[PDB]
Design a binder for this molecule. Structure first.
Ligand code: AAT
Ligand code: AAT
Ligand code: AAT
Lengths: 295, 293, 286, 293
């Protein structure tokens, strides 16, 4: 008999675990692993993809949770739909980071899109996502999607008055090639690469374990864009579960220029984002307002 | 020994592991020191110090409060129904042995009497001794602390309270479950005055989806107005916590007066007027689980 | 550009771990995992094979550590060589369990062996060992080796006055099973069974000894270090129909052995039978 | 509060993790409660209760003693040299603040003076209060506790002691520690009388193979007779522990009289005549490491 003939459905036990440490290394998340699907090392970072009984397939970079099959929609829908719905007619989009493809998948739901560029620094992440993370990488096959392997901070500088929307889907500033995507100069390059009525969004971490970088990202973006507003969203497997995103534009206000009918009439599936959540996400708790210097 | 002791420094050897429902995911925290470990006839109490979260309080290995973020939970559970009530004078809080909810309730000058009904006397005593940050309202003359099963205690009252807040452990944890039956919610309804309001912690709609749904269905079957609101809770399972507001007619949005919150003469670290309204906007997956979509 | 073309040597971090809980679930061993080589489930149990930076390839069954490349020799040499060297001319050997192949590998070092049957209950363990545990399964293809997929307690009762040596590697602990091994051995046959650590598994250690002692006239416990098994103190039980492990031991056979031994030697053979007081007390040997 | 307290039961939330050299493997233990955590100017002390092992004492997250099995280590470290000496009257023990080695040494009626030289006074104080199983001999009229650095202390003596035993010291400094230098071993040699004997714990020849080889090499450059012996130690890294016996002529096998052990009037839970001799039989890998094949 051969191995395959004798194999049965793999059942989880209490012996294999994934431990993710949060900034500071005093608190973290642990997950049981039924099996490890892939472990790879590029010139940039380490990729691990495994299966958890409750979360499904989990993707991690350098021991930091990037996506889980059960809840990635929460993050990708909030990072992409806010700017996409606010733009009058988004045709050309640039996504920096997001090798898993989730943000690209959400952006592609918008019929106005003619070209979506996914600029990921690590080619191995793209290859691993194409093969093992089909839930998020389904957009790779879209005729309008173009994948570019490059450092986003260097890539965006090559363009001026080119994009309608730029979305930053980066790792933590201290993780991997992240950090390059957090400079004031970088944000200026994004501003210069957008057209006159362009919009922008960037993941700005949890205002809890990563309060430092959250504040810094907001300061730098607000110094470049006339309109800069932080919005929050639940993210059930990210550090603290309280995630922040920063919307920015050259005039379009995230509340005053929001047309709820665009969302009500959307022809694609949305598992988190909706008209009420859009406006609600901009309501900040007092401690967050205090950090940003608002109240 | 006393002369030789120095400030205790954290290492990587002592840990607290909190398993979430299902035992497949959990949270881990480094422990610099264990302040107290005690066992009552009901459950086990552990209070320890974590370098980032400060003092941590756990019941049967489940995180109850953290010095760094407990305000997020307590402010949302308490201030939503308190600010919606026209003039809350008499309040009943079931559970909440740590005292956080009582503390928030006491910030409203309108309160003349607030009963804190905790089932475990050991929790009250541990909170008084080690959790000063949340048990600060224990000596307030308006506060009355009683030890009893809230499910039975509430039955002593009819047309008595302006606000009833359920600050309970999980439906499967230490004496909980008594606080999640339809019989219980009806008694809460009966214990409230004609225009009374209500709030109850209804778990995270992620690891504890089952109990979240059941709590909503049971509450909605008793109260004419039943609405779920959400809030961030940085150290609770999933970080997405739900609370269910209920009333005999008062609407959480339609009858909300943002001015009352703006002119509030007390400190609020999470809750505010825009957050109050925003907390009721539910993401699609939550609406779907509740049959609201 | 290509996936394989972008891959580099995998570096160990602090996020993947293997936790082995000991009997009682109050203490255990943890190991960092650089990668998981194989995870599979048979009708009988779960197999996990992974790589640890210090121990090398690690093989676990149902979350219990079975072998480690760094130290498996300690266990396999003590379980196998004590009975093999004590037998005057071991030609036919039966090994029950030992799916990894380690005991089989040690037994095959003895030139007198003509046939060594490896009776493993789970075929998936044999196939996984053949593919991923080359260090221990190297004897699978030896013409003298015969692999049988069967329950050892059922398989052994098919034989009478057949084997010179029987070794029980980690139904296989009943008095009737031991009696079946006794009946399957020749008049001068010898036996060894791994009998656990007299620490976390003291209950089973005592029971195994009692049961073996009710069948074999000569029953003697010996001990050895096993650096990755629970407690590090492992016991083995030698048994026979007359051959004494100390009195009939010939040191010269070991001194002149022409095969590699990384643990076992003539001094260790005799020393392994010296039992600390707490062990003697547990077995009632004063 | 004490009136409400019941016997504390262990759950699955509190843990102690010990990392072995290399940090790729380690041991974890469940904690029912933490008895004492303290920090001296030298190291951190943690004493807790484990359901199977009883009271556990760890220094800087390295397991030093466990109630269930400390006898294995202390008996082998102390009894081998004690029974080999003709008439041990004056004994010096360096390290071992828990007191176990001292306890075993005191079982020998010939002893008139046994000095326990511990570098950290907090260890002695904590052992008195929380490690009664091992510190029971601290107040024996023949015992003297000295708080000092053993490398400095031993140099104050010449032709003074019958037996010197080096218990655990500075676990975190590894082979580079002050108690593993040729200079220190020479000071020990000089402090011993003409027919003195010596033993030192020399680590596990698995995770700490280098440290083990270094200790043996340095001890052997000083003493004419140097022999490694091994013992089981059920909660130490790898479970295979080594000890190095040394003397100015007394041979551990040629001068061993089993009758002294057989007639011993005190309790021994590990050590006996067969084990004495057997502990000197080294597996091939150990012999190769020491250059004895
Ligand atoms: N989409 C949810 C997870 C994202 C991340 C958010 C999860 C946060 C968790 N705490 S993946 C972030 C990706 O951004 C890439 N990224 C990092 N640096 C650069 C760069 N300089 N140029 C382009 N792409 C980059 C990484 O290689 C990674 O694949
Ligand atoms: N205040 C934030 C923490 C609360 C916890 C919120 C849960 C968070 C989970 N992740 S503590 C809940 C308290 O409710 C008490 N409680 C349980 N059952 C009863 C009962 N039948 N009658 C009265 N009080 C009771 C418990 O003993 C516990 O002290
Ligand atoms: N006997 C079993 C437990 C011992 C430990 C054995 C555990 C082994 C684990 N792998 S505790 C050893 C004590 O020796 C002390 N020691 C360290 N340095 C010195 C010094 N310079 N002079 C005197 N005593 C010292 C330590 O402070 C420690 O408390």
């Amino acid at each position: 008999r051969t191995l395959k003939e004798l194999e049965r459905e793999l059942q989880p036990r209490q012996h294999l675990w994934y431990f993710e440490y949060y900034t500071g290394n005093n608190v973290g998340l642990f997950m049981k692993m039924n099996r490890v699907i892939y472990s790879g090392q590029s010139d940039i970072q380490r990729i691990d993809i495994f299966e958890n009984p409750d979360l499904g397939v989990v993707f991690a970079l350098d021991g930091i949770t990037m996506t889980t099959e059960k809840d990635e929609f929460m993050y990708h829908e909030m990072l992409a739909h806010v700017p996409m719905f606010l733009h009058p007619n988004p045709k050309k989009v640039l996504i920096i980071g997001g090798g898993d493809g989730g943000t690209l998948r959400e952006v592609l739901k918008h019929d106005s899109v003619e070209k979506a560029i996914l600029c990921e620094v690590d080619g191995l992440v793209i290859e691993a996502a194409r093969k093992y993370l089909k839930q998020t990488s389904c957009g790779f096959d879209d005729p309008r999607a173009e994948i570019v392997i490059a450092n986003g901070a260097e890539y965006v500088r090559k363009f001026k008055n080119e994009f309608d929307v730029i979305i930053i889907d980066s790792t933590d500033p201290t993780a991997g090639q992240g950090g390059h995507l957090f400079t004031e100069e970088f944000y200026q390059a994004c501003y210069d690469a957008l057209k006159e009525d362009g919009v922008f969004s960037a993941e700005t971490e949890d205002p809890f374990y990563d309060i430092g970088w959250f504040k810094l990202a907001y300061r730098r973006i607000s110094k470049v864009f006339p309109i800069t507003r932080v919005y929050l969203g639940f993210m059930t497997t990210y550090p603290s579960g309280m995630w922040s995103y920063t919307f920015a534009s050259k005039g379009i206000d995230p509340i005053k220029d929001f047309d709820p009918e665009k969302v009500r009439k959307f022809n694609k599936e949305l598992k988190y984002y909706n008209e009420e959540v859009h406006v609600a996400s901009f309501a900040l708790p007092n401690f967050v307002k205090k950090e940003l210097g608002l109240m």
